[PDB]
């Protein structure tokens, strides 16, 4: 921070004594179930060498956790969201550049513990007969423990360029009724993948053997709300003061099948079975500081 | 945040040097026992591309945890709130759009621990007879631990569009006199669902065998107080500067029945047996910046 | 909050550039032992659609943990506070409405832990007689742990209307000399309820076998200090600018009896034996912005 | 708070752009060892319906933990502070009322844990003789844990009236050289009360067998520093603008006796053996906004 | 705090719109190794009934942990600091009074845990010679745990009067190479006091068997830096506007002796063998608002 | 703090409405690998009785952890930093005094736990023959636990005078591949000191058997960055307004030797074998408020 290098706080920050031009653009893609929102801010600081546009992608991508197929009563299938994506792209002919982005990838930490214990014990034995026994003993024990936090979904900033930035929120693993955690690659010889299996040997039909969406992550059914920031830079004396930008919202859906094996339920997961893409093109006009569809 | 991208704090926020027009609209639905409150704020920031209305839905939906049926002395029934809901809806022909909402769905986390220990031990034995023996041994142990936080009620933002938004607070699980936790699907072959059962084999009438409301969650009896925010956007040069909006408060009630099985009490739960709905229509006047009933 | 929806902090709050008229009304009810204080604030914000009165109920309701009856040396009784209550009520003919209140009911939470461990062990046994034995073994263990916080007293907001709001602070459970915790329904076949029993066996008389108030919760003897806020709304161009409001302080007292059973002490608790009510009527003058008795 | 009911922070607080008249009154009672300090603040807010005087009682009451009697070498006595008290009271004929006080009694909490474990184990045994045996076993375990914090001294607000307020800081229990904790009622059939006993069977005179004051709580020897606030209200157009107020500092001392029982040391405690009182009368002049002795 | 009694923060504090006259006085006592620093602040608030002088005693008292005597190779002695003291004293004839001081004695706390577990277990044993046995068992366990924090040095405000105030920082206990903790009274029949013993039976000179200063508390060798505040009050229209004040820095040194007992090392601690006092007299001129030597 | 003695925050601090003259002096000692940085601030507050110079010593002393000698393949030596030092000294003829410094020595704390458990158990045994046995047992256990934090390096303020101040950062102990922790005095009869030993009996050249610098503290290789502050006072009407000050950066290097004992590696540490000293003289001009080399 500034204080670490003997600088007053906020001294080197952009946007002092500046009129910021903000705006909101709202779209609803009904086919893909995506509520897309762009909150933009034009910052023209005279003390900065460029004009800045801060674009915040927000809204909600619906999860759409849904039983989609029912083959009789012994087979069923569930479509569920394994990844949500948000991407911003500038055409290669533009002179505006992606300058900043938030959030970024963080370094994960773990806690390590080591234990060494040793002990001695003794006992003296007797009975009515009169035989007096005895026992001396010693023991040593070494232990190691590893502790870390596992989120249900991971937020990842994909490798950005000056023309393209993107984030993905991907499924990590989930607890199923205090069991697990299970992920997309969990396998069991008898039950297969038990990610969304409600009962192991219930006598119901397969369509009713999926985990209740209320008992799972709320991102799976109700959906994920992005909050991502991108900063675009522009030269002040450039000839063309118009830019185009593409914003894409994406949802990747996996296919979880349950089938009855005459003795118990078996679950299987197929990755990236479906992809729902929703693209929008926006026009930046830097001169009057506005963003339009 | 702004500071993460070298921007001064609050630079890109709406509502600076603006006169905000606030208001309160209070109604009480006596039949459904709902104290509905709307706190609205009109924000017309010249630097923003649209007019904003922030609507905060507050008040209290009473829980109404109540013994409602007494079939003699061996059977009884309890109505209890399994879900509270708040929905805001714009008519399809309106020009105003739902732009923002709070709270949203968060990603849940869990803590994982793994342990590996190994040890050696030895002992020497003797007695009066002079028999000296010895023992040497080794052991190895692997352990896994999963820790996470479980609320009594979950707040879920249902998948919004630009015309409707909604929240639901749903019953997750509860502790019954240091036992459990129990939820709506808990089942035991002997006792059934023990969610609100006071005693396993008490010799009272069934109407007095339900858990005391003071020993349960306070949401079950006294009720839930919403605090939800939604932001509506409007274009400045629009022909019609009047909007209609519907606000709905909802309570879903489950039916918990206790019956005597000649040896002990058995509990059963039926989901979503009743739904109490309180709908209310408001008129937005964007020019006068007022909300009316 | 405001920052979550891109609004400046405090933008949508009431009370900017407003002269607030505050006042204190103090009364002491000697027969009921209640020090009642009302701290009121009149807020007339021109940008708000109506006039606000914030009423804060404060003061202290004495606990009155007291030995009241001594029948010889074998039977004694103790009166103790099991609930404190504060209620505000508007007459049904008034046009002022209760619009807000604090505190409200919060969602309780708990921590869940699951553990699975497995281990293998072996040992080789020797003897002077040349005996060489061996043992291989394995074990598996599953564990569950539940953690939560239990206060001595619970604060509950009772279901409000637009004319009536109330809070109750009720006894939850208590630790008795590192034992328990015990509550009003704790029962033991030999000792009965041991909530305030000092010793299980004791040659003393029953009046001296009660837990002394210094070792219990301080709310039981010295009392509870309310701090509750209510917001009342008033239309500006209403014909009548006078309101009446009733404030009630209440204490519910249970009866704990100790009796000697020729071998040990037995305790019994009777709920809601006594109720002490203290009611006050106040006059709101909205034009003069004052509150009086 | 104000923000919980949509009010800006500090909107309803007293003392905005007001000239506050502060003062300090210091006295030292040498016989009782009490450094009494009154810090007063006169607040006359035009927007408040009354004049306010905030009186802060500060200072230090010395503990005076000391060996006071030495009967030979087998008996000794120690005087120690079991309670510190601070009381303020107005004469019954005054018009001024006690309106507020701090600190108050808070609700104590405790943490509860319940654990259920079950496991299976097996082993196979052999020797040179060829005798092969086996063992299969199962176990179940239930546990409960209670966690809470115990201060050395408890601060209690005694039940106030409009003319009288008081606080007491009372001895709760303490640790004696990693043993205990012990309190005033601790009893052992062999050693009696071991609260301040240094050694159980040391061969010294009883006057040197008391715990060193440096190893006990510092309140016992160096003393307790009060910090209590009282708010007194006065009507503005009252005829008499003079008030009298009494401030009392109190110390209660217990008597801990050690005596030699020809085999070990035995300690007994007598409660409230001595009381030291220090009273001071102050004159409040509301017109000059001054306070004097 | 002010907010607890509905007062704006900082309303009742001294020093608003006041010119504060600060000053610094530095002395180094070379014989006693004490760097004494007085930071004073004259505050003359017109709204306060007295003149205030805030004196902050700072600097450093060197620990001076050192081997001082070496009698041959079997006996040695180490001088170490067991207490640091700072005292301020006003002459009996002065009119100024000590009114405030910081820090003060606080109340210590501990965490108490109670555990109750019970379990049942069973095992079925087989054998080659058709032998089948069984075992049923049960167990119950009760546990108590006490947890608290032990600092190396305790800071204690000694009982102040209106003429003198004092603090002492005293040695509590220390960990010696992961052993202990040991204090000044620790005794072992074989090794005596092992507070600063490096090895139990090392074959070195006694002067080299003391714990290295870097492995002990840094207060023992490098020393302690006081930071204490005293507030002195003065009447405004007093005839004599000159005060004298004495500031004393003190160090108490214990004597730790090691001697060889032909098999191992034995340590002995003698308390308060040396005392180093450094006294300074300062002159307060209230009219010039200055402090001098 | 000020608020503890009823004084507004920052009332008694130096440097209000003052023009502060700051400066930076950077030098790099290539022979000793020391980047020395002095950040100075002249503060001339009219309300303070003296002129102040705050000097901050910063920069980086490189660790220089390196293998320096390789005698064949069975012996090798590593030079590593065991202490970093920073010293400031005024000549004895100067009238400026060292008045303050930061950081100082803090009091270390530890957490103590004591546990007492007791239990009873019983079992009943039988077999096919018909011998019914029984066992009853009891147990009691006492435990003590000590918990404290151990940094890799300790920062110590050496005993200051009014003419010189110093800090040292010394090596405390380190973890070697999850083993240890080891310090400079660690000794094992077989392996010696294993502080920087990679493998106990690896078959490689001794120069390749040292711990990788990436697996040790980063202070050992990349180095330590001082952040020390000292305040120097000066009289305003002194004759000579020029001061000289010496700033010294120091690194102490230990010698860790590994040698092969025909069966395993043995490590030996020699303390304080090398000392690198970097001295700089600065001229302070109080009239110009500047600092130069």
Swiss-Prot record, chains A, B, C, D, E, F:
SUPFAM superfamilies: Leukocidin-like (SSF56959). GO terms for molecular function: identical protein binding; toxin activity. The keyword Amino-acid biosynthesis does not apply. It is found in: Secreted. Changing residue 35 to I/L/P/R/S/T: No oligomerization nor hemolytic activity, wild-type target cell-binding. Self-assembles to first form a non-lytic oligomeric intermediate, and then, a mushroom-shaped homoheptamer structure of 100 Angstroms in length and up to 100 Angstroms in diameter. Interacts with human ADAM10; this interaction is required for toxin pore formation, disruption of focal adhesions, and hly-mediated cytotoxicity. This is Alpha-hemolysin. It comes from Staphylococcus aureus. The gene is hly.
């Amino acid at each position: 921070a500034d204080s670490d290098i003997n600088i007053k706080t906020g001294t080197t920050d952009i946007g002092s004594n500046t009129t910021v031009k903000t705006g909101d653009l709202v779209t609803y893609d009904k086919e893909n179930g995506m509520h897309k929102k762009v909150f933009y801010s034009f910052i023209d600081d005279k003390n900065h060498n460029k004009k800045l546009l801060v674009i915040r992608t927000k809204g909600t991508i619906a999860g759409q956790y849904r039983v989609y197929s029912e083959e009789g009563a012994n087979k069923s299938g569930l479509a569920w969201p394994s990844a949500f994506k948000v991407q911003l792209q500038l055409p290669d002919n533009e002179v505006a550049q992606i300058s900043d982005y938030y959030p970024r990838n963080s370094i994960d930490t773990k806690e390590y513990m080591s234990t060494l214990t040793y002990g001695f014990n003794s006992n003296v034995t007797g009975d009515d007969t009169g035989k007096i026994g005895g026992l001396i003993g010693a023991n040593v024990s070494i232990g190691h423990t590893l502790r870390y936090v596992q989120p249900d979904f991971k937020t990842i900033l994909e490798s950005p360029t000056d023309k393209k930035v993107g984030w993905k929120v991907i499924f990590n693993n989930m607890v199923n009724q205090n069991w697990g955690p299970y992920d997309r690659d969990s396998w069991n010889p008898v039950y297969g993948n038990q990610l969304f299996m409600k009962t192991r040997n219930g006598s119901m039909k397969a369509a009713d053997n999926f985990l209740d969406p209320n008992k799972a992550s709320s991102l799976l059914s109700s959906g994920f709300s992005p909050d991502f920031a991108t900063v675009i830079t522009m030269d002040r004396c450039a000839s063309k003061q118009q830019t185009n930008i593409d914003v894409i919202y994406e949802r990747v859906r996996d296919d979880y099948q349950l089938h009855w094996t005459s003795t118990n339920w078996k679950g299987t997961n197929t990755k990236d079975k479906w992809t729902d893409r929703s693209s929008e093109r926006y026009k930046i006009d830097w001169e009057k500081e506005e963003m339009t569809n």
